[PDB]
Amino acid sequence: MSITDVLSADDIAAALQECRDPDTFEPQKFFQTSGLSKMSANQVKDVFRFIDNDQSGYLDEEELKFFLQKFESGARELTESETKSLMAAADNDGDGKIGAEEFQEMVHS
């Protein structure tokens, strides 16, 4: 009850199909196709608040294991490869613990 009736529902319906295939889930591609890169920083930050359920102040990999599970039930998150493709670009450090800032950067692109 946040993103699912803003816009993103349509974008994820696209994302779902455009990255249907196993090991295809490009990060920048996803951020565009998901509308996140169209959303303003404000909205992008809000959605991140809904992402980090744990509120721990980092989007750690094993939390990222349920990133899009909050939007769809049967999202890609289970596939570590696709998850790690997201992680890989999101993590503008080379550490793997992704801050909201890091995500805002990658999405803002």
Ligand SMILES: [Ca+2]
């Ligand atoms: Ca967290």
Ligand SMILES: [Ca+2]
């Ligand atoms: Ca990082």
